[PDB]
């Protein structure tokens, strides 16, 4: 059909469709007189999974030959969402299987609709742990993602009178065919027990043993013929548990419950028993196998040279004491020599700065649970402030700063001290975040080891977020400039010089148009809402936080209505304002947002006078499929946390790749793709960082601004009045009371320069030519958010390694 789709040779479709049969046949055991469209998607997926087989089994047989140095990914979140069309899109067979399919009378398209998301991640951090595996097996690295099986996901939201109710995402309930269960690999970990000293060494002792159970998912490189693998962790009572017994039986579950389900905090801390139970499983369980794999190739002087540990977050910061553990107790290296060991293994990558989320574990739930690593966190700590007050004698409240141990009511491990001092490199994820964790949080750690802090920007998979979600733009571009850049981003640069082409303008507006047209279809026919697909598609879809203010777009959006309701027969730029995202469960405020949005949608879109002009959605179930859709269809992508919080964010990136213009502030990787972009291009506005700083020493004073601003009171006079909540006119007396007294991220501080920014944005949007060419300037500038230049620049700057475009053999 499209050229980046790859070929439908005769003789492939031919055996896709052979083997499609065979699938149906005696792996489903149906005849197609009975076969269902799930039934149809699972004998396509297994054909498609066939494929990869061969190479996966060669990749590894290739790594255990050449014996690289490996890389370990360690994050509790892999987000990867659907696997068929970028399985496909990997091996180069979605031409051939669209052609086999079709023969066959299926659309192959209603086929992927059937797969269930694998939502093993909150949002960002799961996302960029997918991007990051597909980059390493696209750059041909020995990297090896580890993590939990979830049996539960991120909870399914479904929106009830405007409110959100979570549902079990029970995502393995028809069965995943890209896993394989490897029961032959589980390993013991232990838990609680107590510690032992022995004239030669402590001893850990009187464990309760919960089993990991490892289910191997393979990652496709691109075109490589690479497939590294996904290793997650599942939990199983050993056969002895609690072995009255009817009762021991049914207890097995209190063990298995460690991998039960995913936590659905997003930038935010909870210091919950489970969680911590789930970080060790995933820990000890993942060393125990590095350490194996590493012995069949003494001597852990070369463990560094052969092993890299990367912490995504503090959620695996266990590793550190966990590999001093192994290190010192079972292997009897001296201290010294494993600390040195540990440290040149393990690097760790920073993700926030927001306080509340900073993992700060009770040391009475660390004693009891894992005695043994408390221990070796003190030694680690007396050891690294030694090295403190030797390099600041006599600054006492530097030592107090830098404990790994914060004192107070109760004691507490600080995990991100932690895991600097453990550490060889730590990063930030975009540059004004790594600037930020030198300057503020780390400041200290930064002083006494600049050497290393390092940034790492985000990046994007273009094979999912272009290709995959966007083959129309895809192809377009590949017609000017052939198939290169998507393993080579950068070389969307040579769309610059198409900015005055009138064909490449025409092509991309009207990709996007389709693209419109396609989602506007999909709210019709899945969600039964009506929608101007003539509009301006403004979104904002991320996790529902307090500091990505989906607040301040509200108040734009009813800035907007009372804008038309003043002056109804004046001519304004319609837009459809797309808000989507889940909240934590128990975040109250966030489920208030998500209250507050679809109560102004329930007056907006139901105004007679506004007709069209103005509709607001709330897109339910936000999750990684959701993205694919409704990425390629926006014009806007709003990226508005207030400066300073965001530490990257990666949604902004995928807008950037797919021909969204950004309105959004100078913010985590925001600030490089206007650097990148050019900032002519991009709809900047509010504070910078500095701006914040000045009003923060000042005192923010919300009152001040709503004096100031008439169209800002009116808001929040209609608001607290109960105009968009007739029966409930106090509803949102809490959002109220939060912007006026105790706003931590300064909403009302941008609402003015927001809002002009946005009469700049209609202005633009006004001039479709415009439009497009600064939308040209974007997708041709987006080439430094691929993950494959951010994993590049891990691999060579923190984990020693040189990637390779170079193919394995078929
Ligand atoms: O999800 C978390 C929790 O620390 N952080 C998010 O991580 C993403 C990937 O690095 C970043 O893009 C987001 O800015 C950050 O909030």
């Keep these: 059909q499209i050229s980046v789709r790859g070929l439908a040779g005769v003789e492939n479709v031919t055996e896709l469709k052979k083997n499609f049969n065979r699938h149906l046949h005696f792996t489903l055991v149906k005849d197609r007189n009975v076969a269902t469209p799930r039934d149809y998607y699972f004998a396509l997926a297994h054909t498609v999974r066939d494929h990869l087989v061969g190479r996966w089994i060669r990749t590894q047989q290739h790594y255990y030959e050449k014996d690289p140095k490996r890389i370990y990914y360690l994050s509790l979140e892999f987000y990867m969402g659907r696997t068929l069309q970028n399985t496909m899109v990997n091996l180069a067979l979605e031409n051939a299987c669209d052609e086999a399919t079709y023969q066959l009378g299926l659309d192959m398209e209603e086929l992927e609709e059937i797969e269930e998301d694998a939502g093993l991640g909150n949002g960002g951090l799961g996302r960029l742990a997918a991007c990051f595996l597909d980059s390493m097996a696209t750059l041909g690295l020995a990297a090896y993602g580890y993590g939990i099986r979830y049996e539960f996901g991120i909870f399914n939201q479904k929106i009830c009178g405007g409110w959100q109710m979570e549902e079990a995402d029970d995502w393995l309930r028809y069965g995943n065919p890209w896993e394989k269960a490897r029961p032959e690999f589980t390993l013991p970990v232990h838990f609680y027990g107590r510690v032992e000293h022995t004239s030669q060494g402590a001893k850990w002792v009187d464990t309760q043993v919960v089993l990991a159970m490892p289910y191997d998912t393979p990652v496709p490189g691109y075109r490589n013929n690479v497939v590294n693998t996904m290793r997650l962790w599942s939990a199983k009572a050993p056969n002895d548990f609690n072995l009255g017994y009817i009762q021991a039986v049914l207890d097995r579950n209190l063990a298995e419950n460690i991998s039960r389900v995913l936590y659905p905090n997003d930038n935010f801390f909870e210091g919950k028993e489970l969680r911590l139970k789930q970080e060790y499983f995933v820990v000890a369980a993942t060393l125990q196998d590095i350490i194996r794999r590493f012995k069949s190739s003494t001597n852990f002087d070369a463990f560094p040279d052969k092993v890299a ?90 030592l107090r700063r830098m404990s790994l141990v914060e004192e107070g009511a109760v004691k507490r491990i600080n995990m991100a001290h932690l895991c600097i001092a453990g550490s060889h490199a730590v990063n930030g994820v975009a540059r004004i975040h790594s600037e930020i964790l030198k300057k503020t949080i780390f400041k200290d750690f930064y002083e006494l080891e600049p050497h290393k802090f390092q940034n790492k920007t985000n990046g994007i998979t273009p094979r999912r977020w272009l290709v995959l979600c966007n083959p129309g733009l895809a192809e377009i571009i590949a017609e000017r400039i052939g198939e290169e850049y998507i393993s080579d981003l950068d070389q969307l640069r040579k769309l610059l010089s198409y900015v005055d082409d009138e064909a490449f303008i025409r092509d991309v507006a009207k990709v996007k148009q389709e693209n419109k047209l396609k989602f506007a279809a999909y709210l019709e026919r899945e969600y039964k809402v009506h929608i101007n697909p003539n509009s301006l598609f403004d979104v904002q879809v991320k996790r529902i936080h307090e500091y990505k203010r989906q607040l ?85 992508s709003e990226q508005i946390s207030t400066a300073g919080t965001e530490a990257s964010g990666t949604g902004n990136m995928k807008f950037m790749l797919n021909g969204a213009l950004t309105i959004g502030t100078m913010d985590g990787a925001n600030v490089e793709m206007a650097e990148e972009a050019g900032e002519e291009n991009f709809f900047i506005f509010g504070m910078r960082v500095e701006d914040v700083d000045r009003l923060d020493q000042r005192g923010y004073n919300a009152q001040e601004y709503y004096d100031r601003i008439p169209e800002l009171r009116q808001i929040i006079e209609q608001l607290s009045s109960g105009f968009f909540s007739p029966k409930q006119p106090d509803l949102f007396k809490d959002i109220v009371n939060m912007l006026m007294h105790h706003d931590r991220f300064k909403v009302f501080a ?23 060419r600064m939308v040209i300037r974007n997708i041709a500038t987006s080439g430094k958010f691929s993950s494959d230049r951010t994993i590049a620049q891990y691999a060579r700057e923190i984990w020693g390694v040189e990637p390779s475009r170079q193919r394995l053999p078929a």
Excluded at 750 to 772: F, G, H, I
């Design 309 to 398: 540990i990367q912490l995504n977050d503090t959620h695996p910061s266990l590793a550190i004491p966990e590999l001093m553990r192994v290190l010192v107790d079972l292997e009897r290296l001296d201290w010294d020599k494993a600390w040195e060991v540990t440290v040149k293994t393990c690097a760790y990558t920073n993700h926030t700065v927001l306080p509340e989320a900073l993992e700060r574990w009770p040391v009475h739930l660390l004693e009891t649970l894992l005695p043994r690593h408390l221990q070796i966190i003190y030694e680690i700590n007396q050891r690294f402030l030694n090295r403190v007050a030797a390099a600041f004698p006599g600054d006492v409240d530097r």
């Design 552 to 636: 301040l777009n509200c108040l734009h959006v009813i800035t907007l209505y009372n804008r038309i309701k003043k002056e109804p027969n004046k001519f304004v730029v319609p837009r459809t304002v797309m808000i989507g995202g889940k909240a934590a469960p128990g975040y109250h405020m966030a489920k208030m947002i998500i209250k507050l949005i679809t109560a102004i949608g329930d007056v907006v879109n139901h105004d007679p006078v506004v007709g069209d002009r103005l509709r607001v959605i709330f897109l339910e179930n936000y999750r990684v499929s959701l993205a694919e859709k409704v990425i390629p269809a926006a014009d806007l």
């Design 750 to 772: 941008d609402y003015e320069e927001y809002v002009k920014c946005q009469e700049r944005v209609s202005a633009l949007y006004k001039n479709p030519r415009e439009w497009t």
